[PDB]
Design a protein around this ligand. Structure first.
Ligand code: CLA
Ligand code: CLA
Ligand code: CLA
Ligand code: CLA
Ligand code: CLA
Ligand code: CLA
Ligand code: CLA
Ligand code: CLA
Ligand code: UIX
Ligand code: PQN
Ligand code: SF4
Ligand code: SF4
Ligand code: SF4
Lengths: 200, 184, 59, 86, 670
């Protein structure tokens, strides 16, 4: 009974053959044993790519944003509201078109891989710059894509929550007079009993 | 000749123009931010809540919670200002004419609910079709159940594609029509 | 931790200028105790998985 | 008195006969089923109308049907105990 | 031993009954699974498993009650204004119950103290705590901790006894042992233990509070160390109950401690007497009643009778400090125990029927016709007499002939035995009052009290008629001669013999629940109107009394229209006009919901299941049309289940309606 390389105190996750993290098989909960892991790979790749683009845009907006005629909020979270509804509508339209056409209308966890079991996360976009590495460094390129995607996902999460704890821009990290985060102003039962809101 | 008295109080538009087809042109209604009954009702709400607030200590937590309630009430007053309310009640109205572009319109909630309700029904139907057994209805196949639940998002297209391709309905000669009404 | 806190070792923040007895309540009201609980929760989820997979003999 | 009729769909269960609390039903030989027997109701004057026979009948729709006739009730069909009608 | 405690049956629902082993073919399977869940008798395996299940389930429920007590204690320690209530109980309403500020629910919390807003509780837990010498938050913390520990202990014991007990287990059948140890060690040796608790913690504390030292020098005096106060410090001679404590408006706690000591002594002496006492006559009862259902019915009847005695004794035999003036608390303590008395009496009747069907009955079932016939006659006699005095008064008052009605100012029906029942209390010829509030004044019983007591007797007798008719006619009847083979609960025997619907003892309980509900709704209304009209209320310094209802009972309760107008209409003004009023918004809403639920029950009560089955089939056609096939086939509720659902909704809705109606009014008036 082998153990996973990543978490050595847990059994090695089966159904996680070599895709990217075959050297550090990491599935403690076991979604790969519960779900079609090809769909899981597709979701992870789409999340990683969307988050790479999201980190780049989130960083860029406060400084080199400002499309001619669009208004500029310093807090990049507020940029959704302080943007033209027309540009946002066209952008969502383009995203939906790309999502629908790429999978030939089989955009569904049941129907995603039912007849066109092409490859997990492959869309034929820019494949001309791949496969010249003799299927050995192409796997390394896929590994780099996955690592950058996961790092970008965690980074975008951190950027969003930093902008929330600061309630301002992003890059003025630890702004003047910030003196630490205590901004979560939502009451809680433990908060109610601790702060003596109830009782007495 | 004063249609108000002719019809026992109710008033008629008496004008045939397309510009009056909107709900905002109705003489029964009026924007809430300039309606006397709206002002009086929300002022009475503020007065009652404030009178309750003074009954407690100044530095207590109840005082702070009542301040938060007062802020919520004032935010509600300023938020419903653009909503239409009747010229006699002051209570804002919900628009059910398919306007799509008025405060308090019922088109957006209708669209959202219809989408999510079709999603729920489609997920349930997909699970029932893919589990053609009674054992799978008492002991839910949770992976398949959540797979169908996630797959239900494309219901407005998949359902129509099944309707036109003869995969949703079934001919009446394949299900029990009902009790016999004749034979002799 | 108790030794270090009693002997005077502190984090460079004025919010931590409390005795070790009140450290728990002060930091619960400050916030870091909730975050520590979240992190110990994820680590204990992994520990619970370890126990479940060891007692069942999977590992 | 009620009306207890036996139809051809009977398969000779004998369950209807066993369920009857007043010995209304009986088994008669026949040749329309693999059991070579069908039910009969020679004594429906003793049929109270409990319809236990209908509960016990396993055919798709009951091979034995009890038709209630309330404007027809006799002392036996009513289960009269304190009072005699004879 | 415990290696057989496996989770493999958790996924296998319905394992306990062999009738559910075929699988969930229809939706009736679900309801049957829920119905047979606690029916240990009919479940699979030997009789030893029945004993194990019964005992362990008793322990689990005991743990549940302990958890509820722990929750109440924690609410009192950390979610209550018990501090200011301790300091000034006559100006602060008890409240250990808050509501979150969501969806405007903030409107439910009301001003109870200058530093607290919440829902006024009427459970009387604050008076219990004060009578239990609980002053600091630490005491409530440790009470909650002990109750949680008891919950864990009882849960673990219930878990253990499913395998400690075995096929050879027999300790539950040793009824001599059970009776002796229960009686002595609990009723005697624990009553004296509580007497010790009171003598050593209440009398050291409650007199200190009554002495005006709510300070009690903090812990310098309150934390015991007061052996210079004497046990009978302020008995003031007199007789227990004749003279109340003027400060707390209750019986002196020294007298309560003496009562508990003497009752424990009496119970211990009775346990000693039981070694040689009167027997050999209840001996047929002794041998024939060794069964689960019979002892369950006996205990249910006994506990329900004790509950009604508690209901009548908690109101005008004031034991708790500062409780007689807290009128909503008094009302709740009476009425809740009244309802529990009714419900547990009905359960006793049901389990008597079950015992008759499972075990073998006794001699009284052979002359059942004279019994259940003279019961019928007495029910008819007191129904055509008690109620009609109301109908007669109503008709002759409508006709304008008030001199011909049954009233005090007219033809009067004197309550002869009650008026000569000055034995109870036998207090001095005046009243007692604490602070603008009446503690207790003797209820002057007149004509209206006579008529309403006869109404109570009539309703009790009809409910008893239904129960005893179900019990005695369980095995067989002149109508159906093999009801024993039909089981305990069945819809009918068929449309034959004119119609046999609702002959089962279960259906007799089904009707008896309606009649018990109707019986003590009148009890609730009689109490609620009589106390307001003739006991509760304000005072005048010139010894004049201004009650809440201004003496409406003796002049209006003689006619049904009086009940409709002065009780259900005039006294419902508080609940009906309770919208946007901070404390009583939920009571108005719950009044509306109780009406809705009560009317909703009628759909199940009046309709049969065949119509609903046909409608379900019509809908299932549309479901099958779109390839939506529920393989757990939809079936309408069974006849017995339809009746059960109807009865439950009926009683719940009506109880909620009364509940809101009484509580909102008493909260507004106080
Ligand atoms: C997940 C990736 C992601 C998402 C969701 C968005 C979303 C958005 N961007 Mg953006 N952006 C991204 C990546 C992304 N961007 C990247 C990678 C870059 C760097 C090239 C930018 C550079 C950028 C600029 C310079 C601006 C935006 C703006 C906007 C907003 C208006 C929509 C728009 O520009 O339509 C584009 C449709 C085609 C919208 C909220 C505009 C805005 O509202 O700023 C206030 C704007 O001025 N973005
Ligand atoms: C956000 C905007 C958006 C856009 C631009 C598209 C665009 C497209 N979708 Mg699509 N889709 C979207 C949102 C969107 N979708 C959403 C939100 C869902 C989830 C319900 C789907 C679910 C979906 C499915 C399941 C399928 C598509 C398909 C298609 C393609 C067929 C178009 C066609 O022939 O129409 C013809 C022209 C018309 C006017 C018909 C449209 C009918 C309208 C609504 C009336 C096209 C590329 C199909 C395909 O094969 O993709 C290549 C397909 O099978 N989509
Ligand atoms: C069981 C382990 C444990 C637990 C539950 C705590 C819990 C706590 N410590 Mg603590 N501590 C521990 C071990 C532990 N400590 C050890 C081993 C050390 C020696 C390095 C310290 C040194 C330490 C200091 C110097 C301070 C705390 C403080 C605190 C409080 C705020 C959290 C914080 O900033 O910690 C910070 C903890 C560290 C930086 C040390 C972590 C090192 C390992 C991973 C543990 C909190 C009550 C603060 C406080 O409120 O004091 C009043 C504070 O100023 N701790
Ligand atoms: C068994 C009896 C019982 C009952 C009826 C209640 C009922 C209630 N408790 Mg409670 N409680 C109980 C036992 C009980 N508790 C016990 C034994 C403890 C000690 C562990 C507590 C500790 C406790 C706290 C600390 C709080 C409550 C709160 C509440 C209220 C809201 C609960 C909530 O938010 O839902 C939660 C629902 C779930 C977690 C779903 C499961 C509610 C009236 C809250 C309250 O009143 O807020 C003002 C609150 O803050 N309770
Ligand atoms: C009404 C409550 C109640 C009753 C009547 C009993 C009765 C009994 N228990 Mg028991 N028990 C209870 C609650 C109760 N328990 C609880 C709450 C726990 C959890 C702490 C236990 C834990 C427990 C254990 C661990 C054992 C008993 C045992 C016993 C038996 C002998 C103990 C004795 O002399 O007394 C006896 C049948 C013993 C037994 O079965 O003897 C063979 C035994 O080993 N009980
Ligand atoms: C059954 C429950 C119970 C318990 C656990 C206690 C516990 C206690 N009581 Mg107590 N008490 C109780 C019931 C109880 N009481 C009742 C019902 C009364 C009647 C009002 C009293 C009256 C009472 C008084 C008046 C005093 C106590 C005292 C005490 C404390 C020390 C005395 C002791 O333990 O006795 C030890 C046991 C004995 C004295 C009995 C010995 C008798 C011998 C063995 C028999 C031979 C006698 C010889 C032949 C002559 C102790 C906290 C005393 C105190 O304040 O201490 C703090 C004290 O002065 N109690
Ligand atoms: C000798 C000591 C003694 C003392 C001081 C008390 C004192 C009390 N008993 Mg009591 N009682 C005692 C012995 C005692 N009892 C014995 C030996 C028994 C067994 C027969 C009872 C059985 C008993 C019952 C059944 C009831 C009382 C009740 C009461 C209370 C009402 C008093 C009243 O109105 O009386 C007027 C004279 C009072 C606290 C009543 C109560 O608790 O009221 C709520 C009640 O219902 N007692
Ligand atoms: C100590 C009390 C006690 C005990 C141990 C039992 C034990 C038993 N009873 Mg019983 N019973 C009791 C009191 C008790 N009963 C009372 C007081 C009544 C009168 C109402 C009844 C009436 C009664 C009947 C009529 C029947 C039983 C039956 C049974 C047996 C199986 C029960 C079962 O599986 O139900 C499973 C448990 C449930 C279905 C609980 C469902 C919840 C109830 C029905 C609704 C409650 C609504 C709730 C209070 C309000 C909701 C709040 C709202 C705001 C949402 C079992 C031996 C049955 C049997 O066959 O006996 C052999 C049977 O037919 N009992
Ligand atoms: C014609 C055709 O075919 O097209 C081709 C084109 C081409 C080029 C050949 C192709 C490609 C590759 C592409 C497009 C590759 C893009 C890759 C990107 C944008 C990666 C971003 C990673 C961001 C990260 C990790 C962010 C990290 C952020 C971090 C760590 C933030 C860290 C912070 O601490 C810091 C630094 C500050 C604090 O405030 C907190 C935060 C912000 C969190 C394709 C796909 O083949 C297709
Ligand atoms: C309505 C009705 C039905 C049909 C009612 C059924 C089948 C009830 C089951 C419906 C679902 C399963 C109940 C689940 C709860 C409700 C869907 C929601 C209740 C809580 C809401 C307030 C959210 C019967 O089967 C029946 C049988 C015998 C006598 C009378 C009647 C009867 O009156
Ligand atoms: S139960 Fe029905 S099928 Fe069977 S013998 Fe009787 S009538 Fe025939
Ligand atoms: S209705 Fe009853 S009595 Fe009549 S034949 Fe059927 S089972 Fe026999
Ligand atoms: S109506 Fe219902 S309860 Fe009455 S005999 Fe027919 S099936 Fe039985």
């Amino acid at each position: 009974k082998e153990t996973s390389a990543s978490v050595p105190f847990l059994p090695k996750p089966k159904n996680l053959a070599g895709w990217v993290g075959g050297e550090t098989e990491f599935d403690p909960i076991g979604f790969s044993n519960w779900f079609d892991m090809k769909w899981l790979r597709e979701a992870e790749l789409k999340h990683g790519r969307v988050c790479m683009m999201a980190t780049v845009g989130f960083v860029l907006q406060p400084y080199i944003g400002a499309y001619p005629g669009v208004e500029m909020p310093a807090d990049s979270l507020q940029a959704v509201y302080a943007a033209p509804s027309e540009a946002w509508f066209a952008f969502i339209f383009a995203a939906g078109y790309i999502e629908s056409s790429s999978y030939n209308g089989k955009i569904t966890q049941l129907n995603m891989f039912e007849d066109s079991d092409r490859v997990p996360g492959n869309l034929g976009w820019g494949s001309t710059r791949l496969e010249g590495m003799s299927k050995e460094e192409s796997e390394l390129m896929q590994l780099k894509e996955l690592k950058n995607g996961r790092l970008a996902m965690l980074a975008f999460s951190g950027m969003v929550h930093h902008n929330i704890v600061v309630k301002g821009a992003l890059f003025p990290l630890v702004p003047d007079g910030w003196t630490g985060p205590e901004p979560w102003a939502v009451g809680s039962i433990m908060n109610n009993x601790x702060x003596x809101x109830x009782x007495x | 000749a004063k249609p108000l008295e002719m019809f026992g109080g109710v008033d008629i538009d008496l004008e045939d123009t397309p510009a009056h087809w909107t709900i905002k042109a109705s003489p029964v209604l009026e924007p809430c931010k300039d309606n006397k009954k709206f002002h009086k009702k929300l002022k009475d709400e503020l007065y009652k809540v404030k009178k309750n607030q003074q009954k407690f200590a100044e530095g207590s937590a109840a005082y702070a919670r009542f301040n938060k309630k007062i802020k919520m009430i004032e935010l509600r007053e300023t938020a419903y200002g653009d909503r239409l309310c009747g010229k006699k009640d002051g209570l804002p109205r919900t628009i059910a004419t398919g306007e799509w572009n008025v405060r308090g319109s019922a088109m957006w909630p209708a669209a959202i609910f219809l989408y999510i309700a079709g999603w729920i029904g489609w997920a349930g139907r997909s699970y029932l079709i893919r589990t053609n057994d009674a054992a799978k209805e008492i002991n839910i196949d949770v992976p398949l159940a959540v797979t169908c639940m996630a797959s239900g998002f494309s219901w407005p297209v998949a359902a129509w594609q099944e309707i036109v391709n003869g995969e949703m309905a079934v001919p009446n000669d394949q299900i029990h029509n009902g009790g016999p009404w004749n034979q002799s | 931790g108790w030794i270090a806190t009693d002997l005077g070792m502190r984090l460079p923040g004025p919010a931590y200028q409390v005795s070790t007895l009140e450290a728990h309540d002060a930091m619960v009201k400050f916030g870091p105790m909730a975050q520590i609980l979240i992190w110990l929760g994820i680590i204990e989820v992994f520990s619970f998985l370890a126990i479940t997979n060891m007692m069942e003999g999977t590992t | 008195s009620h009306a207890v009729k036996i139809y051809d769909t009977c398969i000779g269960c004998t369950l209807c006969v066993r369920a009857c609390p007043t010995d209304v039903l009986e088994m008669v030989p026949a040749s329309i089923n693999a059991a070579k027997q069908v039910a009969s109701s020679p004594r429906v004057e003793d049929c109270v109308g409990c319809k236990r026979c209908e509960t016990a009948c396993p055919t798709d729709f009951l091979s034995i049907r009890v038709y209630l006739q309330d404007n027809e009730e006799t002392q036996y069909s009513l289960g009269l105990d304190l009072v005699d009608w004879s | 031993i415990f290696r057989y405690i496996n989770t493999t049956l958790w996924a296998k629902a319905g394992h306990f009954n062999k009738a559910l082993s075929k699988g969930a073919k229809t939706t009736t399977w679900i309801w049957n699974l829920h119905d047979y869940a606690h029916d240990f008798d009919i479940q699979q395996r030997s009789t030893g498993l029945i004993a194990r299940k019964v005992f362990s389930s008793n322990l689990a429920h005991l743990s549940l009650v302990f958890f509820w007590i722990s929750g109440m204690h924690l609410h009192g320690a950390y979610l209550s204004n018990y501090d200011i209530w301790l300091k000034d109980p006559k100006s602060i309403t008890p409240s250990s119950h808050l509501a979150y500020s969501l969806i405007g629910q903030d409107i439910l919390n009301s001003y109870t103290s200058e530093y607290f807003s919440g829902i006024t509780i009427t459970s009387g837990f604050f008076q219990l705590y004060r009578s239990e010498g609980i002053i600091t938050q630490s005491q409530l913390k440790y009470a909650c901790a002990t109750s949680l520990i008891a919950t864990l202990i009882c849960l673990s014991g219930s878990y253990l006894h499913m395998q400690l007990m075995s096929k050879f287990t027999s300790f539950y059948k040793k009824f001599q042992s059970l009776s002796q140890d229960h009686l002595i060690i609990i009723f005697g040796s624990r009553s004296t233990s509580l007497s010790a608790h009171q003598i050593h913690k209440m009398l050291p504390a409650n007199p200190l509070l009554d002495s005006g030292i709510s300070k009690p020098s903090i812990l310098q005096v309150i934390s015991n160390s007061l052996s210079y106060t004497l046990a009978l410090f302020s008995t003031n001679l007199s007789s227990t109950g004749k003279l109340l404590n003027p400060s707390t408006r209750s019986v002196f706690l020294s007298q309560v401690a003496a009562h508990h000591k003497t009752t424990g002594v009496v119970f211990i002496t009775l346990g000693l007497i039981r070694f040689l006492t009167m027997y050999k006559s209840q001996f047929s009862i002794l041998t024939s009643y060794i069964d689960y259902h019979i002892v369950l019915s006996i205990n249910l009847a006994l506990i329900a009778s004790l509950s009604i005695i508690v209901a009548d004794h908690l109101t005008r035999t004031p034991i708790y400090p500062h409780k007689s003036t807290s009128y909503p608390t008094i009302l709740c303590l009476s009425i809740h125990h009244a309802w529990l008395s009714g419900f547990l009496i009905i359960g006793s009747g049901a389990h008597a029927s079950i015992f008759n069907l499972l075990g073998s009955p006794t001699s009284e079932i052979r002359h059942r016709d004279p019994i259940y016939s003279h019961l019928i006659w007495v029910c008819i006699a007191i129904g055509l007499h008690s109620f009609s005095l109301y109908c007669h008064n109503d008709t002759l008052e409508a006709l304008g002939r008030p001199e011909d009605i049954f009233h005090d100012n007219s033809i009067q029906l004197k309550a002869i035995f009650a008026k000569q029942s000055f034995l109870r209390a036998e207090l001095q010829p005046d009243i007692e009052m604490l602070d603008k509030k009446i503690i207790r004044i003797t209820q002057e019983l007149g004509t209206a009290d006579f008529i309403v007591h006869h109404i109570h007797a009539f309703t009790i007798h009809v409910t008893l008629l239904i129960l005893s008719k179900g019990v005695l006619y369980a095995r067989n009847s002149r109508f159906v001669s093999d009801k024993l083979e039909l089981g305990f609960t069945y819809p009918c025997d068929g449309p034959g013999r004119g119609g046999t619907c609702q002959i089962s003892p279960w259906d007799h309980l089904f009707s008896a629940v309606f009649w018990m509900y109707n019986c003590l709704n009148v009890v609730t209304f009689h109490y609620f109107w009589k106390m307001q009209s003739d006991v509760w209320g304000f005072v005048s310094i010139q010894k004049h009394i201004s009650h809440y209802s201004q003496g409406d009972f003796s002049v209006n309760s003689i006619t049904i229209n009086g009940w409709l107008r002065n009780l259900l209409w005039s006294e419902a003004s508080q609940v009906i006009q309770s919208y946007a009023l901070s404390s009583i918004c939920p009571y108005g809403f719950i009044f509306l919901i109780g009406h809705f639920i009560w009317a909703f029950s009628l759909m199940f009560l009046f309709s049969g299941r065949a119509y609903w089955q046909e409608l379900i089939e019509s809908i299932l056609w549309s479901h099958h049309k779109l390839k939506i096939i529920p393989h757990i086939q939809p079936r309408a509720l069974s006849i017995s289940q339809g009746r059960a659902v109807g009865f439950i909704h009926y009683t719940l809705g009506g109880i909620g309606s009364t509940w809101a109606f009484i509580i909102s009014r008493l909260l507004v008036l106080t």
